[PDB]
Amino acid sequence: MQIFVKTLTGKTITLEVEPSDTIENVKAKIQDKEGIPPDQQRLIFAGKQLEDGRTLSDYNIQKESTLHLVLRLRGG
Amino acid sequence: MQIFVKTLTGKTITLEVEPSDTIENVKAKIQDKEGIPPDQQRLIFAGKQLEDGRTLSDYNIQKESTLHLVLRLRGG
């Protein structure tokens, strides 16, 4: 299925994923596709930050669901 | 998600947090559970002493991760 990722600049990117994909997998797609390491990605769906070890199906993410990508430096 | 907190006496407590919860909010939760003021709490993950203004996700604190709690009096 196809889901969209919205950035804070208003850009929209697309991914082909499956319900079984974990959030870290989706962050890995964004890394290969856009060059951002997962350490710097935060994914938000329905106002909730998504947990790496859970799947897209755990969050009821369906086809043409829109996630929000937020870029973040890691903790110091 | 569930996190674990380890003290200097080997005791393990647990909390139900969100990836976006700030370290300030985790200390308040420990205050809810143990009555210890946040001022007296130092939270540590991977040897790093965490910053109250960062989120758990900024430190790669995830499902069933174990933080360490050290108690210290304020400066203050």
Hey, is A37 helix, strand or coil?
coil
**Tokens representing A67?**
């996630």
Rounded CA-CA distance B21/A33 in Å is: 29
Distances from the Cα of A20 to the Cα of A38, B30, B39, B76, angstroms: 19, 34, 42, 50
- Residue pair B63/B2 in contact by the 8 Å Cβ criterion: yes
Which residues, other chains included, contact B31 with Cβ-Cβ below 8 Å and sequence gap of 6+?
A: B37, B38, B41
Bridge partners (DSSP) of residue B3 are B15
Q: B60 contacts in A (CB within 8 Å)? A: 39, 74-75
Q: After which residues is chain A broken (C to N over 2.5 A)?
A: none
Resolution (Å units): 1.6
CA distance B38 to B25: 9
Q: B14 forms bridges with which residues in the sheet?
A: B4
In chain B, what residues touch A73 (CB-CB under 8 Å)? 58
Q: In one letter, which amino acid is B71? A: L
Q: Are B52 and B32 in contact (CB under 8 A)?
A: no
Angle at B25 between CA B63 and CA B9, to 5 degrees: 70
DSSP state of A63: T
Cis peptide before A76 (omega within 30 of 0): no
Cβ neighbors of A50 (< 8 A, separation 6 or more) are: A23, A43, A44, A59, A67, B19
- What is the helix (H) or strand (E) element at residue A31, kind and residue range? helix A23-34
Tell me the C-alpha distance between B20 and A46, whole Å. 13
A16-to-A23, A46, B18 alpha-carbon distances in Å: 13, 20, 27
- Chain B's closest residue to A52, CA to CA, is B62
Count other C-beta atoms under 10 Å from residue B6's C-beta: 15
HSE-CB for B49 with a 13 A CA cutoff? 5
Q: Residue A28 — φ and ψ, nearest 5°? A: -75, -40
CA distance A19 to A60: 9
Residue in chain B nearest A72 by alpha carbon: B58
At B26, give phi and psi (nearest 5°): -70, -35
CA A65 – CA A56 distance, rounded (Å): 10
Q: CB distance B1–A72 less than 8 Å?
A: no
